Scaffold this active site. Structure first.
Site, PDB file in Angstrom:
ATOM      1  N   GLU B  25       0.801  -1.228   0.000  1.00 17.55           N
ATOM      2  CA  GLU B  25       0.000   0.000   0.000  1.00 17.55           C
ATOM      3  C   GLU B  25       0.834   1.279   0.000  1.00 17.55           C
ATOM      4  O   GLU B  25       0.295   2.381   0.137  1.00 17.55           O
ATOM      5  CB  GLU B  25      -0.949   0.023   1.197  1.00 17.55           C
ATOM      6  CG  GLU B  25      -2.012  -1.095   1.175  1.00 17.55           C
ATOM      7  CD  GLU B  25      -3.140  -0.895   0.152  1.00 17.55           C
ATOM      8  OE1 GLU B  25      -4.152  -1.651   0.234  1.00 17.55           O
ATOM      9  OE2 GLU B  25      -3.040  -0.021  -0.745  1.00 17.55           O
ATOM     10  N   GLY B  96      -7.940 -16.439   0.546  1.00 19.07           N
ATOM     11  CA  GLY B  96      -8.653 -15.172   0.527  1.00 19.07           C
ATOM     12  C   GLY B  96     -10.142 -15.429   0.572  1.00 19.07           C
ATOM     13  O   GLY B  96     -10.867 -14.816   1.363  1.00 19.07           O
ATOM     14  N   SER B  97     -10.604 -16.347  -0.276  1.00 17.43           N
ATOM     15  CA  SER B  97     -12.020 -16.709  -0.322  1.00 17.43           C
ATOM     16  C   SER B  97     -12.499 -17.254   1.040  1.00 17.43           C
ATOM     17  O   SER B  97     -13.557 -16.861   1.537  1.00 17.43           O
ATOM     18  CB  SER B  97     -12.242 -17.754  -1.440  1.00 17.43           C
ATOM     19  OG  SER B  97     -13.596 -17.784  -1.867  1.00 17.43           O
ATOM     20  N   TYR B 130     -13.507  -8.155  -4.569  1.00 18.94           N
ATOM     21  CA  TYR B 130     -14.697  -7.780  -3.805  1.00 18.94           C
ATOM     22  C   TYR B 130     -15.937  -7.627  -4.662  1.00 18.94           C
ATOM     23  O   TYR B 130     -17.037  -8.015  -4.261  1.00 18.94           O
ATOM     24  CB  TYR B 130     -14.432  -6.502  -3.024  1.00 18.94           C
ATOM     25  CG  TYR B 130     -13.407  -6.652  -1.937  1.00 18.94           C
ATOM     26  CD1 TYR B 130     -13.578  -7.583  -0.909  1.00 18.94           C
ATOM     27  CD2 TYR B 130     -12.277  -5.814  -1.895  1.00 18.94           C
ATOM     28  CE1 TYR B 130     -12.666  -7.671   0.137  1.00 18.94           C
ATOM     29  CE2 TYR B 130     -11.355  -5.905  -0.853  1.00 18.94           C
ATOM     30  CZ  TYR B 130     -11.567  -6.834   0.166  1.00 18.94           C
ATOM     31  OH  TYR B 130     -10.687  -6.910   1.244  1.00 18.94           O
ATOM     32  N   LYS B 131     -15.803  -7.018  -5.828  1.00 20.91           N
ATOM     33  CA  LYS B 131     -16.964  -6.868  -6.678  1.00 20.91           C
ATOM     34  C   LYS B 131     -17.542  -8.239  -7.130  1.00 20.91           C
ATOM     35  O   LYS B 131     -18.749  -8.372  -7.289  1.00 20.91           O
ATOM     36  CB  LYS B 131     -16.606  -5.991  -7.888  1.00 20.91           C
ATOM     37  CG  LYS B 131     -16.638  -4.532  -7.525  1.00 20.91           C
ATOM     38  CD  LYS B 131     -16.434  -3.630  -8.706  1.00 20.91           C
ATOM     39  CE  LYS B 131     -16.458  -2.163  -8.234  1.00 20.91           C
ATOM     40  NZ  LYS B 131     -16.415  -1.235  -9.376  1.00 20.91           N
TER      41      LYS B 131
END
Lengths: 164, 160
Positions: B25, B96-97, B130-131
């Site tokens: 980031e 992640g899922s 996310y989408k």
């Protein structure tokens, strides 16, 4: 227009709900008084509120004594830790101009100092220039725009699909 | 792998992952928090960790999520996802899922009606992740901008 600022107690839930609805007029408030009580006064409160109370000679026309509030809670960022998050801040129109908002912000700042919070975060609508400037006059910066952060949500129907 | 709540012992691994994410980031220099803070403040947040049966240097923790609860005056309790990161060599479906599925379970138990989080403007990998799960951009839809007033300015208001 004497007023005092104090923490909300369980007994203030109907007034908090009334003010949230007042705030909505500046939108579908589905929260109930019951929600405010269980979420705010259990062993693990999900929010804290400071309220502004006035004496009888200045009660609202409906006969109420609570004329403003600030709802907040503590959050955390992995870079610096603890933050005070201001969720909503509202003073009824007929009770503005007497110092209520300023005393609420002063007390929120003192609470932040007690918390050793590094910053106070909150949302402002991008088009609400008056509000943006009110906060900028107090030292605020638009973190979303300066650093390139967008707020997202995943609603209940999706969380349900993933949870099952 | 398994997704489980962190323990005090995991504070070392959580900090290591926070620093990897920070680098992603462009904020690694801003991580001023310590394993000490993580310990005192967490045992203000909750962490999930992805544990495997190990990395080449011996770490068993390869992913994490940090969350806490927030509140919306219109609808109540919300779950807020503060950070989410899976080590590079461990990406490739599942972790992640599964972290999202565990977070969704946390939300269902809190009767949280939504999960909120921030995403960098240019983070297409996360935006799409996310989408694909139903996320909507509130900064677009409702025009919200995150503002901050740092401590030096809070001190001014506190002291008048």
């Amino acid at each position: 227009a004497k007023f005092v600022i104090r923490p909300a107690t369980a007994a203030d839930c109907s007034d908090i709900l009334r003010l949230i609805k007042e705030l909505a007029k500046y939108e579908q408030v589905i929260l109930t008084e019951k929600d405010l009580l269980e979420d705010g006064f259990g062993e693990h409160p999900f929010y804290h509120c400071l309220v502004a109370e006035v004496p009888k000679e200045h009660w609202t026309p409906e006969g109420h004594s609570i004329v403003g509030f600030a709802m907040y809670y503590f959050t955390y960022d992995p870079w610096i830790g603890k933050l005070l998050y201001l969720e909503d801040f509202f003073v009824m129109s007929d009770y503005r101009g007497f110092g209520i908002g300023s005393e609420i912000l002063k007390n929120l700042s003192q609470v932040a100092m007690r918390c050793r919070c590094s910053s106070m975060h909150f949302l402002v609508a991008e088009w609400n220039e008056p509000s943006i400037n009110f906060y900028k006059r107090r030292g605020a910066s638009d973190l979303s725009s300066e650093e390139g952060w967008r707020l997202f949500k995943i609603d209940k129907e999706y969380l349900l699909k993933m949870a099952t």
